[PDB]
């Protein structure tokens, strides 16, 4: 149908907007601490601590498969990256501190993406 196509045109434009948002969030992590999944060979106990691992590359594969239906689902994954890190790592570590900085600097990008998604549908 012509309906399914226009919904596919919208999802595709949402995917284009989330791609740009994702590139902007990732620029706030120049150390690439959150780039890749936490290694299970190097942190074998990780899954005893953290039940839903997340990282930028895993968000990227979901993105290019048009796996995010809305901005909220995308925000949930970003929050997991941050919240996982702040639980596993203690306050006086480079990892925890990197999360806090990504959270505060990401807020601005997420604040405007919410207005743009509403605004253009
Ligand atoms: Na902790």
Residue numbers in the entry: 22 to 142
Tell me what the authors wrote about this structure, in their words.
Applied to a series of fragment screens, PanDDA yielded markedly more hits than manual inspection of density, far more quickly and all with high confidence, in both known binding sites and new allosteric sites.
Using an averaged ground-state map for subtraction, as opposed to a single ground-state map, reduces experimental noise in the ground-state estimate and thereby also in the event map. Conventionally, the analysis is challenging as it involves inspecting a lot of 3D space—the whole unit cell in each data set—for convincing evidence of bound fragments (‘hits'). The group deposition feature recently added by the PDB22 makes it realistic to deposit all the many changed- and ground-state structures, as well as event maps (see Data Availability).
